[PDB]
Amino acid sequence: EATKVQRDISAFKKVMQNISLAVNKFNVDIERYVGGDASHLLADGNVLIKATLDGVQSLQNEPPLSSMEALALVGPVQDLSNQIMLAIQNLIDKKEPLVQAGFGGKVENNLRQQEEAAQKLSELVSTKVPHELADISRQLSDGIAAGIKKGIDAF
Numbered sequence: 001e002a003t004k005v006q007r008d009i010s011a012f013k014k015v016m017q018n019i020s021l022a023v024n025k026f027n028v029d030i031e032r033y034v035g036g037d038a039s040h041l042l043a044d045g046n047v048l049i050k051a052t053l054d055g056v057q058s059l060q061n062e063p064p065l066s067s068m069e070a071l072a073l074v075g076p077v078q079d080l081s082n083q084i085m086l087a088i089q090n091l092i093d094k095k096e097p098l099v100q101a102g103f104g105g106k107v108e109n110n111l112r113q114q115e116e117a118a119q120k121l122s123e124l125v126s127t128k129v130p131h132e133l134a135d136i137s138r139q140l141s142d143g144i145a146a147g148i149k150k151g152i153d154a155f
């Protein structure tokens, strides 16, 4: 069936973040540990065990993830790109009824605004990505830009 309202997968993200923070607290402490009393390291370990077991409880009621829902978790940038590309094709698919409704020009206008806004966010992201990810990040934004252009060219 057609795309539905996005599944709330926040419980999964929360478990991941909780475990991530507990692991980080341990890494900060262990790397600075020289010798002597290690009670605080054992406490860090206990916090991590509890975060893990809390995850077992937190996710006990979650239905299985679909392919798309799993990607939303594992590869959120890829998920977003996929959903944007879907939006573009879905829009192009409705060109005829949109024109029959009198909205063809307005859609083209809106797409030109999407294009300009996307360009601006893409520029900003290019300044925040580490140098070794510059090309892969640009490839992703260029792909979206090309999609928006396809939309514009259809209206």
Ligand SMILES: CCCCCCCCCCCCCCCC(=O)O
Binding pocket: 084, 087, 088, 091, 107, 110, 111, 114, 117, 118, 119, 121, 122, 125, 140, 141, 144, 148
């Ligand atoms: C009413 C028409 C709506 C058409 C929606 C399809 C166009 C979606 C474009 C969203 C661009 C999101 C910005 C991405 C910025 C970036 O690449 O970093």
